[PDB]
């Protein structure tokens, strides 16, 4: 496909899930070859794995003393739409969580795409690889299309569930919301996270209960969301990705470990 930017500046705002602070984004058009980067307080932070500073409960980037939490949702949307050149100006410390999904970003960006004059140079997975950490595993292998499967093994009523994204099915994962288990909320608060989490932006589940009165958007909403997160973390390779991925219980730490191993192997 062609490299793409946005036709005009696009703004989003609201509370961040971890900081609980209100922040604002401005997405700016950029020329061919710029890449995806964030901008905060005069500093450009490329959306690349070298700038990862934290991976527990979100993927966060930093450079030169400026940090931005929770980049994975906006990056997943840009990856799915194949937007390749843009500056995400952040006024605040975190990307707004909005409803917990990528929907509002997706709908707004998709209607504002500007095709550019060069083709995309994809990051093409060249050979099979497996990364592992304490029972969690991710496998990547060659594919002409981006294909991503996540399999979860939940310790509640959901049990085992799997979901596969393929190209053309972006609408199947951009509405799946971030989620949390009630027995884990004390830990996330104790480590200074989840300050913006509420039933308005998170699907909260108990051992047997669904807290949200509106219920699940899909019976497998959590694994759809985990696929969505992994697609965002894969964009830290610095180019849209062609490969087939399978994650068993992966999280941001393992997603970034895979990205760094793929990047080292091919560059």
* Cβ proximity of 13 and 24 under 8 Å: yes
70 binds Zn ion (CB under 5 A): no
Question: What is d(CA 56, CA 94) in angstroms, rounded to the nearest whole number?
Answer: 14
Place of tokens 């843009």: 86
Query: Does 229 belong to an annotated binding site?
Result: yes
Catalytic residue among 18, 49, 54, 252: 252
Nearest to 69 by CA among 98, 88, 92, 46: 92
Kindly indicate which of the ranges 17-25, 136-144, 173-181, 212-220 contains the residues binding Zn ion, using the contact rule CB under 5 A. Answer: 173-181
Backbone Cα Rg of the chain: 17
Binding Zn ion by CB under 5 A: which of 83, 229, 236, 240? 229
Residues in touch with Cl ion (CB under 5 A): 56, 191
183 binds ligand 3BX (CB under 6 A): no
Question: What is the Cβ-side half-sphere exposure of residue 144, based on CA atoms within 13 angstroms?
Answer: 1
Query: Does 60 belong to an annotated binding site?
Result: no
Q: Which of 34, 103 has the CB closer to ligand 3BX? A: 103
Binding Zn ion by CB under 5 A: which of 84, 116, 149, 178? 178
Q: Which tokens go with 130?
A: 């497996």
Q: Which does 216 bind (CB under 5 to 8 A by kind): ligand 3BX, Zn ion, Cl ion, none?
A: none
Question: What is d(CA 58, CA 163) in angstroms, rounded to the nearest whole number?
Answer: 21
Query: Does 121 belong to an annotated binding site?
Result: no
Burial of 97 (0-12, 13-18, 19+ CB in 10 A): buried
Q: Which tokens go with 112?
A: 């504002």
233 binds ligand 3BX (CB under 6 A): no
Q: Which of 65, 192 has the CB closer to ligand 3BX? A: 192
Kindly indicate which of the ranges 25-33, 111-119, 125-133, 179-187 contains the residues binding ligand 3BX, using the contact rule CB under 6 A. Answer: 179-187
* Cβ proximity of 13 and 91 under 8 Å: no
b/e 103-129 (16+ beta carbons within 10 angstroms → b):
bbbbeebeebeeebeeeeebbebeeeb
255 binds Zn ion (CB under 5 A): no
Binding ligand 3BX by CB under 6 A: which of 4, 37, 57, 257? 57
Binding ligand 3BX by CB under 6 A: which of 28, 150, 251, 255? 251
Residue closest to Zn ion, measured at CB: 229
Kindly indicate which of the ranges 116-124, 165-173, 199-207, 255-263 contains the residues binding ligand 3BX, using the contact rule CB under 6 A. Answer: 199-207
Q: Is 18 a catalytic residue?
A: no
Q: Could you give the residue numbers annotated as active site?
A: 252
């Amino acid at each position: 496909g062609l490299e793409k930017t946005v036709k005009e500046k696009l703004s989003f705002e609201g509370v961040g899930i971890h900081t609980g602070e209100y922040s604002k984004l401005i997405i700016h058009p950029e020329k061919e070859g710029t890449g995806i980067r964030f901008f905060k307080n005069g500093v450009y932070i490329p959306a690349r794995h070298e700038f990862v500073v934290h991976t527990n409960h979100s993927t966060d980037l930093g450079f030169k003393g400026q940090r931005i939490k929770t980049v994975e949702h906006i990056l997943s949307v840009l990856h799915l739409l194949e937007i390749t050149n843009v500056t995400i100006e952040v006024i605040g410390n975190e990307i707004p969580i909005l409803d917990g999904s990528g929907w509002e970003f997706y709908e707004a960006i998709r209607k504002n795409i500007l095709n550019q004059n060069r083709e995309i140079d994809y990051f093409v997975v060249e050979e099979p690889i497996i990364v592992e950490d304490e029972g969690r595993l991710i496998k990547a292998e060659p594919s002409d299309t981006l294909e991503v499967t996540y399999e979860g093994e939940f310790k509640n009523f959901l049990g085992r569930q799997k979901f596969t994204f393929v190209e053309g099915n972006e609408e199947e994962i951009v509405l799946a919301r971030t989620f949390a288990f009630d027995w884990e909320i004390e830990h996330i608060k104790k480590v200074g996270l989840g300050k913006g989490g509420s039933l308005k932006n998170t699907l909260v589940l108990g051992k047997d209960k669904v807290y949200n009165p509106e219920g699940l958007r899909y019976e497998n909403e959590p694994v759809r969301h985990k696929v969505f997160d992994l697609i965002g973390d894969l964009y830290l390779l610095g180019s849209p990705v062609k490969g087939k991925f399978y994650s068993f219980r992966g999280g941001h730490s393992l997603n970034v470990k895979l990205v760094k191993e793929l990047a080292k192997k091919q560059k």
